[PDB]
Symmetry: C3
Subunit: 374 residues, 3 copies
């Protein structure tokens, strides 16, 4: 085999991370989806969680009763503002600390006050509810999101969908330095007079990327293919004309970078005034939550309401769907090749794949843990 072991050695941990990285923050829902006193069940990294907002504060608990292991969310019953009672025998837990404070069906039980559901640390920023999945004290959320995502003046809006592919197919697709070819028919092209070449003739391999590995700040890789190559706007087949790219006035996706636990930052995009952020949150081994966020620097309540309107009325359908919908096929089609780990050894990479290789190495070395099941 190895030949293959030597080639994949530096990313063995990544190859094993079918369920994602443990001990990191992950966004799971939009703020508006988690309303006051209205529990919402979610699943991430194979773990079933139940969310709820109490007095404006979002709380997260394991979505499973400690008694007979039923799923609490199968029939949500709350009889006090701060608690949820299991629908089977009334074991009652607090949302803030998961403690079993009462048992409606037997107030004399010696089990009362002796147990607690697992709770997940929560952070709600930029219209997203983030959960920390791990066993160690959480580090700052800033270390798990792209640089600038938490900037005070950055207005953010987004949407999410479930993709039938492992989360890694999402990140591989998202940070793939030379895949613009798949977007050559996007309505966003002439819809926003954006320039989109067919591909790139890469320069020196050592110049194509830059990695950030310091402590106290997000760790990731910058894709520098753009400034170190000759954009391809026309290509031939066996010497004959075959196809052309799409030249336009606006140059976007000037700075592309990916960060642990696996979040993309495309700047500027889909317009010189916007920045796109993407997450590929693991749900289970065969699915991921593809979260697409668009941000715009705002200086007043007025230009904020303005961006909000432009987001829903234009960008969602023109870009988030009009441009990115073609990415889903890529993820679904690569899925089977990599689902059994064979792809990591059999793939035949070329020049523009240097960036993903650097991401695989960095992710393998700096992730805070490999999520596993039982």
């Amino acid at each position: 085999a190895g030949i293959a072991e030597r080639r994949t050695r530096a990313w063995a941990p990544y190859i094993d991370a079918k369920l994602g990285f443990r001990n990191h923050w992950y966004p799971v829902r939009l703020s508006a989806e988690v309303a006051e006193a209205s529990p919402v069940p979610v699943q991430l990294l194979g773990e079933k969680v139940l969310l709820n907002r109490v007095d404006g504060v979002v709380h997260a608990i394991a979505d499973r009763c400690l008694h007979r292991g039923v799923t609490l969310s199968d029939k949500v019953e709350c009889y006090s503002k701060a608690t949820i009672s299991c629908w089977y025998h009334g074991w009652t837990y607090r949302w803030d600390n998961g403690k079993l404070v009462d048992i409606l069906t037997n107030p004399t039980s010696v089990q009362i006050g002796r147990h607690a559901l697992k709770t997940y640390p929560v952070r709600e920023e930029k219209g997203l509810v983030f959960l920390f999945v791990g066993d160690q004290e959480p580090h700052d959320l800033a270390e798990d999101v792209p640089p600038g995502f938490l900037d005070a003046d950055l207005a953010v809006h987004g949407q999410h969908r479930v993709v039938d592919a492992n989360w890694r197919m999402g990140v591989e697709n998202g940070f793939d330095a030379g895949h613009v070819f798949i977007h050559k028919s996007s309505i966003l092209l002439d819809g926003n007079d954006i320039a989109l070449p067919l591909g790139f003739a890469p320069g020196d391999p050592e110049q194509l990327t830059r990695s950030v590995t310091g402590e106290g700040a997000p760790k990731g890789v910058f894709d520098l293919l753009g400034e170190h190559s000759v954009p391809i706007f026309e290509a031939t087949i066996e010497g004959q004309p075959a196809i052309q790219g799409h030249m336009g006035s606006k140059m976007v996706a000037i700075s592309i970078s990916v960060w642990l636990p696996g979040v993309l930052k495309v700047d500027p995009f889909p317009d010189p005034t916007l920045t796109q952020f993407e997450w590929y949150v693991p749900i289970d081994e065969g699915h991921h939550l593809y979260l697409q966020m668009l941000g715009r620097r705002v200086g007043s309540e007025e230009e904020a309401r303005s961006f909000e309107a432009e987001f829903r009325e234009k960008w969602v359908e023109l870009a988030l769907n009009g441009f990115n919908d073609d990415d889903i096929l890529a993820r679904r089609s690569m899925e089977p090749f990599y689902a059994d780990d064979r792809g990591w050894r059999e793939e035949v990479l070329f020049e523009s794949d240097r960036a993903i290789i650097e991401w695989r190495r960095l992710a393998s070395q700096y992730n805070r843990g490999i999520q596993t099941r039982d």
Copy 2:
């Protein structure tokens, strides 16, 4: 792990009985569903059987041809009153002894008279067709049904449904001594003026149950929680009023018991003039046949026709469905927790679970065999 082994030790056989107990009688269909010369296929304990009534007598044979292993019931063909002929090559077997008595496609075959389909002992009582699944001589049916079920004066009617959970989830749910909380919204409460607390404050653990262990009579456990506890009608959470039970003049479920191979007896229920009997017949590892029978002592053919009409016009929708429908969620929600055996070790039981523990111990020690595949 060692603490788990010691705790589950007395019921390890039960943990392995995913397919039920072998060498016991099991009801599979209502008498009316097995009509004269109208073969009906069934599956119990993972075994596929074909039933038919010939001259009033119900017969049961393995639902698989000895030749090429096809399922006989895929296309039932009978060319003589006493036989069934496989639809593929005409191997012909007698219903009464499973004997290969003819081969329509080759009357001179040396195989004729040299083989026989497996046959299952049958007993038809109280409108139910019972099959003995096992290799030893059948003991009396009375030993596998609750006390009184076969009383000459008991008029019986019932219905069944397939539940998406292991049979043990059905029995655990049925004999769960303190689960009335799940039935607090049943239309039966107001519908039949039945009292229903939210739970119970159990007395001495040693007084909560009584076990009966053969020989020559059904073996099972009596749930004595009602007699040794304080009914819980008012529930609180952290000192504040949370929810309340329901008052009624009719007292039901005075006596609850479960018997091997796994049948419940609730008396009286759902009315002082009735008794409910429940079976959780294993179909395969993930499904069971939930059989609900209601019995009423009758003294004349007049009050028999009366009970029959009441059963259909009132009790089926008011109780069998109106009360027990909420039980299905419980079985389905516990299913995954116990399907991989981890639930038996990870569950956190409390006081009212003494009864189910006594059942698991009794079932483990006295079952006549563990049904397996291969």
Copy 3:
């Protein structure tokens, strides 16, 4: 059991051939389904292939890009007559030799010209496109089809359907002499005055079959039960009248034979003026492509157009479906019994099964390889 090992010894390879035999020709589609410049994906023996007709010539290549392993046919894109370009990063391959001749997204890539998709030898005869699946040089197509199928004067037409069963269930069912019992109610019987018995009373087991194993020509088995038995047109059950066959004046299925890699020849059928040929091409372990071809010796372009018309207007619904639709249930019902290999040991065969046994032995000894999937 040692008894089972000894019994199945002579056909152990056949038992392992769940995916079919490697190094043989297999028909995959009708010529009309593979049009000029209109790529069509197919799957045989677990391998995904992409077909296309360029300048009237059919080409076949592996349906998977060498780059990231996506399925090319998920979005066919051709920018030059002789090539196909992957929809993801534009790697471009020639249909005739699978060579990676260009990479639209990076014309300077060092990978260009250093790789080639696997190609499959192709043969197009009698309105069918045959593919050779193997690693060795292809032998003559004539060695993998029934005798006379390629005769110059044989006009051929047919249809195919995917069947939910392993390919062997198709061959087993096809070359089975006692199976005519399943066809006793076929509309073809009265519809064409066909004489179809219920079964047969075979003679010496030694003259029931004849094998052909010479080199240079197809290898197979001739079913000689007909010319060596007493056909059963009426049969009794326990001495009493039970069922009758279907006498007629048109004699068909006079000569039945099966040939490697697994193709049946029934002559004449479904009419004295026709010959039926059937293929059971493995798709994957649980499905096969059931190809039904009808041939008629023709001497003029007029009777050729006449047969073509009769095929469409009469034989398709009266025989291909009217007669063979019943064979499908047989294959599906046997499927589970043999899917886990238990069937080969537990089946109880009788006299007329001598023919299938001869096929299993011949197929085991002469197949050119067992197809396997890592």
